[PDB]
Amino acid sequence: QPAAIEAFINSPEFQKNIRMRDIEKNKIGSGSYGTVYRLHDDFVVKIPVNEGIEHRNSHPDRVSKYLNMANDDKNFSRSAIMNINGKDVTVLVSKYIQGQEFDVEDEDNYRMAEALLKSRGVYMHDINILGNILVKEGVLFFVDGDQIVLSQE
Amino acid sequence: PAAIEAFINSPEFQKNIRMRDIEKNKIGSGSYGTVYRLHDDFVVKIPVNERGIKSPENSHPDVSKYLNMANDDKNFSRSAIMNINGKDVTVLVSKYIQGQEFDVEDEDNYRMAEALLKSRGVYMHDINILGNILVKEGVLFFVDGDQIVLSQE
Amino acid sequence: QPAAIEAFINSPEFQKNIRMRDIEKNKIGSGSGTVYRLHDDFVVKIPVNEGIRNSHPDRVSKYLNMANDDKNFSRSAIMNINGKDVTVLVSKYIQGQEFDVEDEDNYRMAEALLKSRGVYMHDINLGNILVKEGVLFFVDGDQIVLSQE
Amino acid sequence: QPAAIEAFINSPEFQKNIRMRDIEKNKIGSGSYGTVYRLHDDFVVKIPVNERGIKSPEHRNSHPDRVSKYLNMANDDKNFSRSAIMNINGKDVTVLVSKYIQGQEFDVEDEDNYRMAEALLKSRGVYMHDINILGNILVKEGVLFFVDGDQIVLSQE
Ligand SMILES: Nc1ncnc2c1ncn2[C@@H]1O[C@H](COP(=O)(O)O)[C@@H](O)[C@H]1O
Ligand SMILES: Nc1ncnc2c1ncn2[C@@H]1O[C@H](COP(=O)(O)O)[C@@H](O)[C@H]1O
Ligand SMILES: Nc1ncnc2c1ncn2[C@@H]1O[C@H](COP(=O)(O)O)[C@@H](O)[C@H]1O
Ligand SMILES: Nc1ncnc2c1ncn2[C@@H]1O[C@H](COP(=O)(O)O)[C@@H](O)[C@H]1O
Numbered sequence: 001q002p003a004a005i006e007a008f009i010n011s012p013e014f015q016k017n018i019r020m021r022d023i024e025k026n027k028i029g030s031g032s033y034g035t036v037y038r039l040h041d042d043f044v045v046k047i048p049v050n051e052g053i054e055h056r057n058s059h060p061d062r063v064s065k066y067l068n069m070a071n072d073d074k075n076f077s078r079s080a081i082m083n084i085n086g087k088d089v090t091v092l093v094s095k096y097i098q099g100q101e102f103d104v105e106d107e108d109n110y111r112m113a114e115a116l117l118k119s120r121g122v123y124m125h126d127i128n129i130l131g132n133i134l135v136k137e138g139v140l141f142f143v144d145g146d147q148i149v150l151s152q153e
Numbered sequence: 154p155a156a157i158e159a160f161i162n163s164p165e166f167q168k169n170i171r172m173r174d175i176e177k178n179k180i181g182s183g184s185y186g187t188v189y190r191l192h193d194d195f196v197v198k199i200p201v202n203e204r205g206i207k208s209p210e211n212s213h214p215d216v217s218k219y220l221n222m223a224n225d226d227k228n229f230s231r232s233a234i235m236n237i238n239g240k241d242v243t244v245l246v247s248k249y250i251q252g253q254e255f256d257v258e259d260e261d262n263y264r265m266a267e268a269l270l271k272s273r274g275v276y277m278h279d280i281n282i283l284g285n286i287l288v289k290e291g292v293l294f295f296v297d298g299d300q301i302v303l304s305q306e
Numbered sequence: 307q308p309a310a311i312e313a314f315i316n317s318p319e320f321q322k323n324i325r326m327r328d329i330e331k332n333k334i335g336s337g338s339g340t341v342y343r344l345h346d347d348f349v350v351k352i353p354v355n356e357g358i359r360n361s362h363p364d365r366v367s368k369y370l371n372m373a374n375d376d377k378n379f380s381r382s383a384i385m386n387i388n389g390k391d392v393t394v395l396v397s398k399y400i401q402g403q404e405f406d407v408e409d410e411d412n413y414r415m416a417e418a419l420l421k422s423r424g425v426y427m428h429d430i431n432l433g434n435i436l437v438k439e440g441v442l443f444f445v446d447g448d449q450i451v452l453s454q455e
Numbered sequence: 456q457p458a459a460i461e462a463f464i465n466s467p468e469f470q471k472n473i474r475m476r477d478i479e480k481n482k483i484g485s486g487s488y489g490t491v492y493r494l495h496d497d498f499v500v501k502i503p504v505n506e507r508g509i510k511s512p513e514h515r516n517s518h519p520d521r522v523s524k525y526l527n528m529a530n531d532d533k534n535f536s537r538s539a540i541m542n543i544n545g546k547d548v549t550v551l552v553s554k555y556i557q558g559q560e561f562d563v564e565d566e567d568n569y570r571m572a573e574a575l576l577k578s579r580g581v582y583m584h585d586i587n588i589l590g591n592i593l594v595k596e597g598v599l600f601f602v603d604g605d606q607i608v609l610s611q612e
């Protein structure tokens with residue numbers, strides 16, 4: 001039998017021609033990255049539309065493989081194709097997790113998440129800010145931006 | 154005697170600023186806010202976007218710390234108070250850098266920027282493979298987001 | 307975290323009693339000592355000239371490690387050559403190109419990196435200090451940098 | 456009336472066709488840079504002919520005209536050195552002429568000595584830096600490495 005996520009993906013609900021406004025009520029998060037929607041009780045879909053469409057987590061296939069590894073669960077997420085406003089678009093589908101953000105800045109919390117990840121082959125790094133890189137006469141400068149992460153090592 | 158504090162303490166800076174007269178100084182704008190070149194050596198990022206809307210939900214100016222760390226320069230940037238149309242607003246002041254974008258899609262450039270930052274105690278990463286940690290009934294889950302870096306090292 | 311260079315040094319290969327005849331094939335550098343490649347990843351400066359500033363491996367290794375911001379970049383070590391305990395300089399082998407700092411842009415970037423590592427950098431264009439009956443004079447030489455900036 | 460150094464440079468001893476064999480006795484030092492000879496009681500001449508008798512960015516103190524400017528400033532003495540043209544074996548060669556200083560190396564490793572020299576140079580518009588070692592710069596896949604060599608000075612702080 002197919003995994004639960006694959007069953008959702010083959011469901012008529014997922015394979016229908018979707019209008020962005022008809023799923024506004026299922027929105028749960030959006031940004032320059034795209035928009036996240038709870039389109040089933042157990043799953044969310046990240047649609048690449050910038051309020052819309054380098055960007056964060058650019059290719060669903062690679063993100064999906066990283067999320068599957070990080071959660072040690074081969075059925076956590078899938079890349080898939082959805083029809084959005086008459087157009088075929090690659091989206092990221094993953095298990096919906098009902099819960100609250102983990103405060104990974106607290107140092108014990110940090111170790112817990114870090115050790116768990118490492119045992120699954122993933123190396124975690126906090127993000128302090130994002131910035132852009134400028135070069136002036138061979139010299140690098142770091143300004144407020146959004147192209148790389150910069151965190152205290 | 155720091156050039157950045159001098160500018161902040163200058164009358165040009167702490168007089169009641171009104172948005173109309175600096176519109177010609179605008180160099181960039183986005184959801185985050187708007188950057189103006191208010192001196193030949195400094196820019197100021199003001200939290201009004203392209204539509205003039207607008208601190209929770211990591212872009213608080215207090216950025217200064219990490220920009221100063223990234224650039225290894227105590228006087229690169231400040232969080233400061235500027236009055237806009239009669240309202241004291243928290244802004245970010247930085248040294249103006251006239252340069253080109255440094256492209257870190259290029260392997261060599263990325264390793265060069267990375268090497269520099271590491272000598273400054275700063276970890277650098279692409280913005281791909283980023284995530285958030287959710288906690289559901291005690292258990293840690295990893296989802297698509299922008300709180301942490303998920304790498305395979 | 308067993309440093310690769312510590313592992314190579316405390317290896318038998320290195321601690322072997324060595325003839326100059328046996329390692330000639332690994333010669334890559336020469337001058338007034340000679341640089342040999344005895345591993346895939348490390349080179350060794352031996353003070354045998356084309357037969358013998360502040361060029362003491364102890365000190366050079368210290369400043370190479372600071373300059374590269376890498377505590378494992380290099381070591382001073384005892385190697386035995388023709389029955390003689392000799393102090394040698396062992397550093398990470400770097401397969402690369404010469405980075406031209408006559409180019410101003412290149413110079414500045416190398417300078418900004420070194421500065422972030424607490425290292426001052428300069429061209430070799432330099433003097434020596436002499437004292438003559440109490441009084442200091444400065445002549446052409448190589449002890450200090452004389453700069454106007 | 457010209458400076459002592461300029462009188463030496465206009466002398467027949469300096470202006471003659473120089474044969475290296477003839478001034479071997481007046482030698483005082485030699486290295487990769489060239490060779491220093493005492494050709495007058497009061498003056499030395501640095502000849503850009505190496506210790507192997509077989510001689511621009513590659514060597515230290517390459518431009519004698521510029522080195523001379525720096526030595527004059529460092530000693531606060533406009534007459535301390537000159538660059539000049541010498542005829543050596545029928546060929547014109549630019550050399551560095553300096554006052555001969557009969558003295559001992561000043562040990563800059565001692566901290567009081569270091570600051571004495573630093574303070575004196577600073578009063579003269581010259582900024583001193585010690586030289587811990589010399590190095591070469593290598594680049595490998597965009598990343599700079601620093602190995603044992605002689606192209607740049609590397610010093611702490
Ligand atoms: N699989 C998921 N389950 C639950 N929440 C998720 C999932 N993937 C993403 N999110 C949340 O979606 C939101 C994205 O909206 P935003 O805060 O604007 O980035 C964040 O709260 C994420 O933690
Ligand atoms: N300190 C700075 N010096 C120079 N340019 C800057 C500085 N901070 C931000 N910028 C530029 O401001 C612009 C912001 O517009 P945007 O591309 O919409 O983010 C970009 O071109 C940035 O590179
Ligand atoms: N750690 C190192 N990795 C790679 N090349 C090196 C290293 N140390 C020295 N060299 C090279 O070895 C050679 C020795 O210089 P030479 O004495 O002129 O033969 C030069 O080409 C140096 O750049
Ligand atoms: N003007 C000068 N007066 C006295 N000694 C000098 C003068 N210029 C250079 N020297 C010394 O001449 C020596 C020859 O160079 P070398 O022996 O290779 O270091 C060096 O020790 C210099 O310190």
Ligand SMILES: [Mg+2]
Pocket residue numbers: none
């Ligand atoms: Mg931009």
Ligand SMILES: [Mg+2]
Pocket residue numbers: 285297298299300
């Ligand atoms: Mg997020």
Ligand SMILES: [Mg+2]
Pocket residue numbers: 434446447448
């Ligand atoms: Mg000398």
Ligand SMILES: [Mg+2]
Pocket residue numbers: 484
């Ligand atoms: Mg000498």
Ligand SMILES: [Mg+2]
Pocket residue numbers: 604
């Ligand atoms: Mg060499």
